[model samples]
Target: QKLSAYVVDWDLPKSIAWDKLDHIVYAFAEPTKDGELSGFTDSQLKSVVQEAHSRGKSISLSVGGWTGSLYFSDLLKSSSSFDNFVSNLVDVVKEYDLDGLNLDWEYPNSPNGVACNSKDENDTANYLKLFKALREKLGSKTILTTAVPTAPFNDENQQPSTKLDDNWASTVDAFYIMAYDVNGIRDKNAGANAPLYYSPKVTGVEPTSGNDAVKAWIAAGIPAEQLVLGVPFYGRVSKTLEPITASTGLYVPISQSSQIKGDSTDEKAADPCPNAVATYSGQYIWRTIAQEGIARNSSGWVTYWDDISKTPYAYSFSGSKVLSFDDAASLQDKVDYAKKQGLGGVMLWSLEMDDDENTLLNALQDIRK
Candidate 1:
């Protein structure tokens, strides 16, 4: 298995599970609005590279995130500017002696990308061109990869984008399919963050599981060996407007955290949807959830497992709250599935989210044995 993890500068040398991971990708190195690279300091860059190498692991620089994708369109469309961006990328790699580059661009050829300022009809083609340029510049030895959504190769309309065809796939080492964050506060109700399979109850919804996502990419002609499934070290919370009434309390209107006062009696009087906004859903990292004693059945919460999706959730009767997240068990399901499907490996969204004992991290590595 090509076990990997994404880490920020502060998560460094201390937080890493070197024995479990084969690669470490630095979280982000942003591109300025003017199409130049910035945000990461030289010391930060050098330190991670040194630490990763010392531990006998390969490290890549991840560029662009949801907020970091703003300048990608304009930069990729302009030849002079695009060349400048690539040159800077090469300089950074050479300066830090990095092993690879991972592009986490939120999307291309879509208006839905967060904080993106430009959208062009040619973005699809320009995106492929960006990789071709990188392949030529970085050469064959440097690993080139990208982070894509569960439906990475498709647009909002569910139409094929063809950006990851064999032509571009040749240039990429792996596509880290981010199979989490399928649902959140913006949704009508509570849902799983990284489900192993699509729930049969939900109709007219796209497949939202690691298994389905890998199959989607394989059907698109991308080899399964070049795919890395993403496992989230976090969970999402949703407060129901009322007590649970169904087997699965999905789409129930929820109360925002801010609206809840000290006690449930105060919370009942407090507006569930203040200002017509239901803060019903919020995201909590694994560490925070554990520290607060909210993992699984702890703190008056009852845990439930979805047999079809192979995911776990917790619902609190007192607070009328629901949380959907992954633990060591759910993660093992994903890792085993990846191995069975002949996938490259599993990639963790972050390293810092795990408990101090390395509970989730060790679970993933244990599967290899």
Candidate 2:
């Protein structure tokens, strides 16, 4: 399986695992309503592209991440604006000589995306129009790809949103399925951020499982060769009023009045007191967790692996904290599953989050070999 990593602008070059990556996606460039790109300068992208190509690695410009999707639907509203966007993108690609373009239009007609501004019944069709324009202009050689949520389309009886069709799949070189972030602040309970498989006990419209998400794309007629599974380099934590019930495993619930807290292992939590907020839901990068020494033997935390989901979780003995995250062992499980399913490869949400030792990246590399 090919291993790809996202290189954020803030991440220094010294932190990258250059030899381990097959592709580097420079995130994120935004499209303004006035036919311009913002967030990063052309020279900045050119520098990264030049270095990546020098190392025989591929690079692409990832446009319109979660917060950057606001202007996309609107940019397609008028032919003039649409033409201008097409022209600007082609120029940017030519200027940087980028290997590809990654369209991360969070969602076209859904309310789930972060800070999204617009949604319409015609959003899907407009997206197709945009794709065709880029594909025709870029030609077949320049890769056109997209980052989609685990559930790319709203299921029947669910919310009305952009539905993926065969034509949409055919337009992109690959579909980077963001299979993480399945559960977060909005969820009533704490669960795996990306479970490999859903338990039979949890029924009724579950869309978080990696196995199920891949099947959904295949069922939508997306070829397996064009699917790139995304894994998280971070973990999700929830504050708990009491210790988690060990028997319940990953389906543990949080007290509605649970208190929020910063890293319990950090010096900031000298008293080990939780944060003041009534509820806690946020991310903890892998490096931070590793540095704080919150492993099975370190601190007062104990790590446990969920057999059914093929994932890992950690809980405090006092029952005040619970974390669901991925480690080398758990991530290797995901890689094995991907290879078993004949996926194109695996993509990490970021490369910076992993430890300088390249723990997670090296794990995937070992599997690829």
Candidate 3:
């Protein structure tokens, strides 16, 4: 529970890329129509898990994240179906010798079309019923964890509904809160995915940052020992013309460029401009881009930092671009925060987004050590 990483289904092979790596968590492998785990073979997963275990690491399996949550209705409807899913899941765990399981309901309270389900009265009850039963089946040694929402909100708000209920806290071993995406889709005008603290000085809404949640959970009576804070290895970016400032700009130093990725989510939105092509990825900022003469900002349309908030935004007389990202420095900030808060530990939303060298991981691990 100290410091860990996530293994997205597609990036499982990337495990080999990391040196001195320890724990590995396989995320969101679906339960097939036949109730079997989709994606790689049990043997394939087993070998990976075994390799990690050989290095004195723990290999936990994660189920029901954004993509794999489609079966919740079916799972809750039929006792037999639930049994089938768990039976198969246990087989995978035993065959692979995994350490635990993570139920990523993003969320029971969320409505994200095909991949998510409701967190209404029946839905929330069903969700908990499913996990409670799974925990009983998996037993104590199997770390029963859940990828819960960043903040404590009503189940109706697209997050799992966990009031300050004693029953809920006892039911879960660890709750990993996703600290990113709190700013929403700022670049596209989705508002702040996450904001730290509001200020008359800052004039925007924050999505109840991770820092807030740690305090909330503790106050809600959950033990800090069972809480795991999530740190994004990437960042979000937007369009605007803000002059660079050391502490409050949308960009950072160029030493980070080598850490950039090529497969960034390329969005060609119609508004702003046809070139309004918004590339939201990486933790680097425009200042870094400016030095290379790769991008330029115009006047009248100005981009400035709310400084008080550690986030950046862009705007013009016409429109703006909002970018959300997590660079090494931001990641370090989060890791340091987790240490300061004395929570369970830090769990990364993923492992792949880090720079090519994966220095983000190395640095955090080094700092944690």
Candidate 4:
């Protein structure tokens, strides 16, 4: 199995454990409605690409993230616009000496994505056409992958598509399932940032977890071999609207009116859908939560592990917040799952969030072992 990391422009890790990783995806070069990609310049990408190559690892630039997918539907609809996107994207790949391109379109044909993202019933169909074109032009040697949601791309009915186009596997090399952020501010109650299993002991709590998502894609026809499990190197904090009386912090009511502060990097960004729902939902990277001990017992936080979810969570006694995160133990279990299920590998959101000691990065190396 391989281990890929998304190195962001804003937060390139202090030091990348290149030896431990198989691929490095540079996070975000947004697509313009006019059919051009924006973000990091050619100069900025060259060094990262060369370094990864020098180290014998492949690197790809990921386009379209949470806020950057607003124009995807519009851009892919027109033939001329689609041609411009594909040609320009291939131009960048050729110029950068990059190994591949990973399209991280938040989603096509879903209101659940950025509030104002252009959506068309034909998004999934158009997306397939785009991938076919990219594959045709970029050639089979160049890798092409997609960053998808827990569920497959929504059908025209705006529901999860039961049957994906058969060409999906032949065209795209891998589908990175963003198993994190399954629950957050939109939820009526606090839940796992990225749960590993599905089990509901509380009323109204749906048994949502990473494994269930993995199964969802498989049920839709994606082979486990063409799948890559995504894990979070961050945590989600939920501050109850009022004091929680329950012993467990999960599935408890949360207040969206006022939010608790996260770490230095948790700056609020305006998304296409900038309504009451937030973009930077209380996130504390693994470095801040674990290495720095922001959620340590010494800091008035009590940590607990749930057998059903196979994840770790903590409660702040004084701050009245619940933090759900992944540690060495949780990541180890994920690696084990990827191996047993015959998955391609595991991909982390952003590498810059890892601790100086590389605690979580080291945990992922188990698949290699």
Which candidate achieves the best lDDT against the true structure? 4
lDDT assessment of candidate 4: 0.83
Worst 10 residues of 4 by lDDT: 241-250
For model 1, which pairs clash?
A: 256-279
- Model 2 scores worst on lDDT over the 10 consecutive residues at 264-273
Candidate 4: tens digits of C-alpha lDDT, residues 1-369:
278899998667767889988989998899988888887766668889888888889999898998789888998888899899998889889888989999999889998777788999999999999999998898898889899998889999889899899899889999999989876766777778888886666443445677888898898989998999999999888886655444654667887775666766677766655564544558888877865575566477777776767788887768788888898999999989999998888999878888778888999997675
lDDT of 2 by residue, 152-262 (tens): 654333353334666877787888889887865455666687788877675422446888788877877788878888998888777654566566566665655533554
Question: Which model, 3 or 4, shows the larger lDDT?
Answer: 4
Clashes of each: 1, 4, 31, 0
The residue pairs that clash in candidate 2, if any, are 242-319, 243-319, 260-275, 261-275
Native-structure RMSD, model 2: 5.0
Q: Mind giving the per-residue lDDT tens digits that candidate 3 earns over 1-369? A: 676678766655454543434456677676555556775556567777777766777778887665466566656656787678778877777766778877775555454423234235355566667667777888878877877776553454444335656656788878887766665323322233334333443333443667777777776667877888877654444433433343544432222211222122333322222343333333433233223222234433334443444443443334233344444445566667677667777787567655445656765663345
lDDT of each: 0.74, 0.75, 0.57, 0.83
Clashing pairs in 4: none
Error of 1 at 130 (Å): 1.3
Candidate 1 lDDT tens digits, 93-178? 88889899898887776655553346566665677788888889989989898998776554435355534556867878799999
